[PDB]
Amino acid sequence: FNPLYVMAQSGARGNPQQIRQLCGLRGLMQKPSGETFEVPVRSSFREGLTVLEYFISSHGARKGGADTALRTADSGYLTRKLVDVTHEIVVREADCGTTNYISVPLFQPDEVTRSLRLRKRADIEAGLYGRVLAREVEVLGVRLEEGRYLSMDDVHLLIKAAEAGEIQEVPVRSPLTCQTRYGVCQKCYGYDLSMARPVSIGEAVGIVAAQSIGEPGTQLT
């Protein structure tokens, strides 16, 4: 029940590396050239750094501050470009009637080139959650019907089926293959993720896309 421990464990405050700098050692430091000092900061913040340790660290601190400063502008410019490309894209109809789709893979070639191994859960979720199946799927004795909006449980089920060797890729309606002019249809877009239900015709989907890609832009290290 140590306060640092509880705060870090619960997700209220702090991560392991900050707690380490408080209790363990401060660690290795960077020179202005990006090359590392051979001599680490052996002191934690509790023990107190030496003048030389403090100075050695100020390089990396300033580098990170300048990084953030120069990054916010590039992120904002990127977001404005994304807004200008996507802004006319709106959900303009319920179904363009296309028969085209994309197949989200559930496996990816191992870097060993050895075999195929299952993708990460979060990655498959970000690829499948809230999408409409373009084709019948029959896995683990369940029928996932064409036209179905994949709930989160539907996604975990498909992950189970893949783990059992019953499916390698899922066919899914996607804006890549939608045929609605000046926009996108409802079935091809899928969920209004903010509501866990099918999107309402009229949603400014392109603006939402730009803002979703841009808003974490300043976190990209």
């Binding site: 140590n2 306060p3 640092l4 509880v6 705060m7 464990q9 619960s10 997700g11 209220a12 408080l22 209790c23 363990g24 050692l25 934690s44 913040f45 509790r46 023990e47 709930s151 989160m152 866990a196």
Partner: protein, 56 residues
Amino acid sequence: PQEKNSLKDLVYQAFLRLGMEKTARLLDALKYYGFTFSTTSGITIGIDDAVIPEEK
């Protein structure tokens, strides 16, 4: 022990199963009791809380 992830999953499940009205009520309740309990829990920070381990 309820923590960031499990509370997030509680909010999402409550959303799906009960709607945004009841989920908003749930969120306000969580806020009320979390604040109340954290007040009287005894949580603080003194220098002897940054415990240097012996293995160092």
